[PDB]
Design a protein around this nucleic acid. Structure first.
Ligand SMILES: [Mg+2]
Length: 47
RNA sequence: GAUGGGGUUAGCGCAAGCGAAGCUCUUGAUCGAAGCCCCGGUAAACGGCGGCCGUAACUAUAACGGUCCUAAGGUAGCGA
């Protein structure tokens, strides 16, 4: 099962190259309560 | 042609010599323009239009950066 290498024709280091493409992104939690937190409509919504 | 330095000298002295005046060879003081230097301009005047090193999500490149040098570092376009 392939991954479409955003980098393409990988010549030198495969690991490093991959780590520098969308597959190993910087992933950020959308936490509640604080900063970058507010949701207009919740997961289940207002009742 | 300023001065200075001679040079033979009417001579005077008993004489080494001083060497009147004048004569006269020099010395170039001063006077003294253009140009040159110098200041600015001009490249459709003649001409000239850089190096070295480092750098970005594999690699590669380097928009970018450091530095040195220049009068300035080749712009548009074009380009084995
Ligand atoms: Mg050919």
């Amino acid at each position: 099962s392939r991954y479409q290498h955003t980098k393409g024709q990988i010549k030198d280091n495969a690991i490093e190259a991959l780590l520098h493409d969308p597959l190993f992104r910087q992933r950020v939690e959308k936490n509640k309560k604080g900063k970058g937190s507010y949701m207009r409509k919740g997961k289940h919504g207002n009742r």
